[PDB]
Amino acid sequence: REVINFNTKWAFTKEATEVPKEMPEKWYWVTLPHSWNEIDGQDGGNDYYRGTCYYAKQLKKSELPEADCYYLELRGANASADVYVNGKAVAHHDGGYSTWRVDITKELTEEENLIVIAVENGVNDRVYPQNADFTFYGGLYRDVNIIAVNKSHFDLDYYGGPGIKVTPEIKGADASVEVEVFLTNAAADQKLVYTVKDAEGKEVAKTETAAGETKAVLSIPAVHLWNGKKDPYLYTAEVALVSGEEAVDAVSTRFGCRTFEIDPERGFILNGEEYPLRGVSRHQDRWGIGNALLPEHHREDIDLICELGATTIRLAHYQHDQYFYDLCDERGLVIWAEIPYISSHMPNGRENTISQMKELVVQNYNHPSIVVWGLSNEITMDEDLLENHRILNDMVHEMDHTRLTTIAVVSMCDIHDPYIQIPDVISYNHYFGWYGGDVSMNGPWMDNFHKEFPNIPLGMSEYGCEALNWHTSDPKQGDYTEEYQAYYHEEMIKQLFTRKYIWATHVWNMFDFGADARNEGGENGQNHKGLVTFDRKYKKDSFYAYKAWLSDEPFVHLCGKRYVDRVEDTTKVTVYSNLPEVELFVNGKSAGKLQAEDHFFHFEVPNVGESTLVAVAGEYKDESHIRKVDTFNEEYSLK
């Protein structure tokens, strides 16, 4: 089995009449990943181009390895797509976030075969998402491959799945691992060789069956538990399809061995031990390239999230890339995965909810980082809606006996609504202190639901506050300053991180992200609730509030480095640190030492002329600068 990368140099256009019959010569050249909304869907106006665009590329047999079948594999085509080979339609897919594939062997009738993929992200009542606070970036924004396999091969046709399904059971110190496999055009005389490998590639179990027996149970004695950030230990499972003495096809996947519970009072439990889930959410886009993300972009996002110290990520609002989920498995992050069943129940969207959720579970069952499947987000923003949830919830329980269902509930929805009783666990999306109200309401709002429903495990799946490069010494809801967002998250941390019954918390959001309908805060087309800016270059102060509570990397961080000119004669200077004591020095002389148990060191500092600020904790330091002015620098003010 060979995987050919197929991303290089497609002809692209937005204004093409019909499927072209010859390779276009005046189209725009893109190399996938590509989204055509990389600029117009990150800048405001809710006007990013939505419509059908064409990608065209020639497939030459002289470059393909010799093989019985060739499959076109699409990792991401947002939102709907059709595939033509030498002009004939061979495939249609609805769902911008999952892998789908098609056997194109029969249509490769020429030495040069025109491969045309039409991709559409228009408005309709059928394909989720339609109503949501993010840009539906159109395009082939994930890899396109060609898969060359033998006539008998592991299934490439079942909902974009890998063709292998690993299910570990923990029994004391050992593990029982069921490995199931799915075959296309297999012969009764072929064998299946199942192997499990160690983190160092060392074989630790091996068994064989006839091809008609597509399950096997392998034992792993003295199992290394996947145990989160403490030890994200991963095994590999391999199954080869063997004709006589030779492997004609092989599939593999990594997996981790763990149990968990979501206890309504003790919160998240992992392998029998309490394992608090304190984290963030992440969209799969980035400034300048839309959602056309490279592997290094996925690695940077998770590096920054690891540096903050999050033990969980909510991967809203749709299926992310396989490489990002692998990264979570490798790094020990606990993951919430969901489908874009969002904001507003579309009666005609029901088929597509089913479809996307099947692809979500089938394609991601093997990732040990995932513990919950999310059915919908804020879906109540009614009987048909309830039936859609029953069906999704029973299908997920049908397909996956080892994970729990959840929803993300909109702030205002009555806690006695019937759909809250449907999934195994729930979380709420609250913005008290940002969309009105006050940051102190969150804690008690959660306590009151907990009182009403003591057996429903309750998390916080969204909470957050907007912040851009604006500054103040009087932080207030709606000035959009870095300082108010810092205060907000300090207060959420204090309320949320001390309530063990909150099973998972997810800052909305880890990064600023694309939302073309947003036109607020001084910079349009973006939600700026991030802890880090859209291009990943600037960690806002609120990022270090969380690092001070969740990371064991010793550091000391000076807040307000961008708020330089201050009117006040004595100015507040906040330091965040996971060390026990910080000393602040103003132009070289101590303004005192503090010991903040909640890691929030609030100093008061004379502001005369220009001053250099140095904060010192053990052997770690940070530096900033302020200066005294008579009038407020109107460049700090959004108004």
Ligand X SMILES: Cc1cc2nc3c(=O)[nH]c(=O)nc-3n(C[C@H](O)[C@H](O)[C@H](O)COP(=O)(O)O)c2cc1C
Question: Under the rule (CB under 8 A), what is the footprint of its own copies?
Answer: 15-18, 22, 25-26, 50-52, 82, 88-89, 91-92, 118, 120, 122-126, 157, 169, 171, 176, 217, 347-348, 350-351, 354, 358, 383-384, 390-391, 394-395, 398, 401, 418, 421-422, 451, 454-455
Cβ atoms within 10 Å, residue 217: 13
Annotated catalytic residue within 120, 338, 359, 378: 378
CB neighbour list of residue 26: distance below 8 Å, 6 or more residues apart: none
Interface with Ca ion in residues 470-529 (CB under 5 A): 516
Q: Measured from the CB of residue 53, what is the shortest distance to Ca ion in angstroms?
A: 16
Interface with ligand X in residues 376-395 (CB under 6 A): 395
What sections of 420-523 are H helices per DSSP? 442-452, 482-496
Q: Measured from the CB of residue 42, what is the shortest distance to Ca ion in angstroms?
A: 7
359 binds ligand X (CB under 6 A): no
288 binds Ca ion (CB under 5 A): no
Helix or strand holding residue 463 (H, E): none
Q: Measured from the CB of residue 132, what is the shortest distance to its own copies in angstroms?
A: 17
- Name which of its own copies, Ca ion, ligand X, none residue 89 binds, using a CB cut-off of 5 to 8 Å depending on partner kind: its own copies
- The answer to whether the CB of 480 falls within 8 A of the CB of 521 is yes
Token duo for residue 54: 């064409």
CB neighbour list of residue 343: distance below 8 Å, 6 or more residues apart: 129, 131, 132, 377, 378, 379, 381
Q: Which is nearer to ligand X, 160 or 443 (CB)?
A: 160
Span between the terminal Cα atoms of the chain, in Å: 61
By Cβ distance, which residue is nearest to ligand X?
158
- Name which of its own copies, Ca ion, ligand X, none residue 378 binds, using a CB cut-off of 5 to 8 Å depending on partner kind: none
Q: Measured from the CB of residue 524, what is the shortest distance to Ca ion in angstroms?
A: 8
Strand duo 582-586 + 246-255: pairing? unpaired
Cβ atoms within 10 Å, residue 501: 16
Cβ atoms within 10 Å, residue 358: 21
The binder of ligand X chosen from 33, 41, 163, 228 (CB under 6 A)? 163
From the list 26-34, 161-169, 278-286, 536-544, the region that binds ligand X by CB under 6 A is 161-169
CA atoms within 13 A on the CB side of 274: 11
From the list 223-231, 361-369, 380-388, 589-597, the region that binds ligand X by CB under 6 A is 361-369
From the list 73-81, 159-167, 274-282, 463-471, the region that binds ligand X by CB under 6 A is 159-167
CB neighbour list of residue 495: distance below 8 Å, 6 or more residues apart: 439, 440, 442, 443, 446
- Rounded Cα gap, residues 260 and 274, in angstroms: 9
Length reported for the chain:
639
From the list 29-37, 154-162, 336-344, 574-582, the region that binds ligand X by CB under 6 A is 154-162
Verify whether residue 63 is a known catalytic residue: no
Q: Tell me, residue by residue from 7 to 46, as one string, x for binding to ligand X by CB under 6 A and - for no binding.
A: --------------x-------------------------
From the list 99-107, 223-231, 255-263, 354-362, the region that binds ligand X by CB under 6 A is 354-362
3-state SS, 153-211, equals EECCCCCCCCCEEEEEEEECCEEEEEEEECEECCCCCCEEEEEEECCCCCEEEEEEEEC
Burial class (CB in 10 A: 0-12, 13-18, 19+), 526: buried
CB neighbour list of residue 320: distance below 8 Å, 6 or more residues apart: 97, 284, 337
The binder of ligand X chosen from 158, 501, 555, 620 (CB under 6 A)? 158
Q: Which is nearer to its own copies, 123 or 222 (CB)?
A: 123
Cβ atoms within 10 Å, residue 562: 14
- Name which of its own copies, Ca ion, ligand X, none residue 540 binds, using a CB cut-off of 5 to 8 Å depending on partner kind: none
Q: Measured from the CB of residue 88, what is the shortest distance to ligand X in angstroms?
A: 10
Q: Measured from the CB of residue 361, what is the shortest distance to ligand X in angstroms?
A: 6
- Name which of its own copies, ligand X, Ca ion, none residue 516 binds, using a CB cut-off of 5 to 8 Å depending on partner kind: Ca ion
Burial class (CB in 10 A: 0-12, 13-18, 19+), 229: middle
The binder of Ca ion chosen from 43, 180, 520, 523 (CB under 5 A)? 43
88 binds ligand X (CB under 6 A): no
SS3 call for 56? strand
The binder of Ca ion chosen from 14, 31, 47, 294 (CB under 5 A)? 47
Q: Measured from the CB of residue 47, what is the shortest distance to Ca ion in angstroms?
A: 5
337 binds ligand X (CB under 6 A): no
Candidates 276, 277, 321, 275; CA nearest to 302 is 321
- Rounded Cα gap, residues 74 and 117, in angstroms: 10
Q: Which is nearer to Ca ion, 45 or 522 (CB)?
A: 45
Cβ atoms within 10 Å, residue 498: 10
- Rounded Cα gap, residues 145 and 320, in angstroms: 18
Q: Which is nearer to ligand X, 339 or 361 (CB)?
A: 361
Question: Which residues form the catalytic set?
Answer: 378
Query: Footprint of ligand X on this chain (CB under 6 A)?
Result: 21, 87, 155, 158, 161, 163, 165, 182, 358, 361-362, 365, 395, 399-400
Query: Footprint of Ca ion on this chain (CB under 5 A)?
Result: 40, 43, 45, 47-48, 516
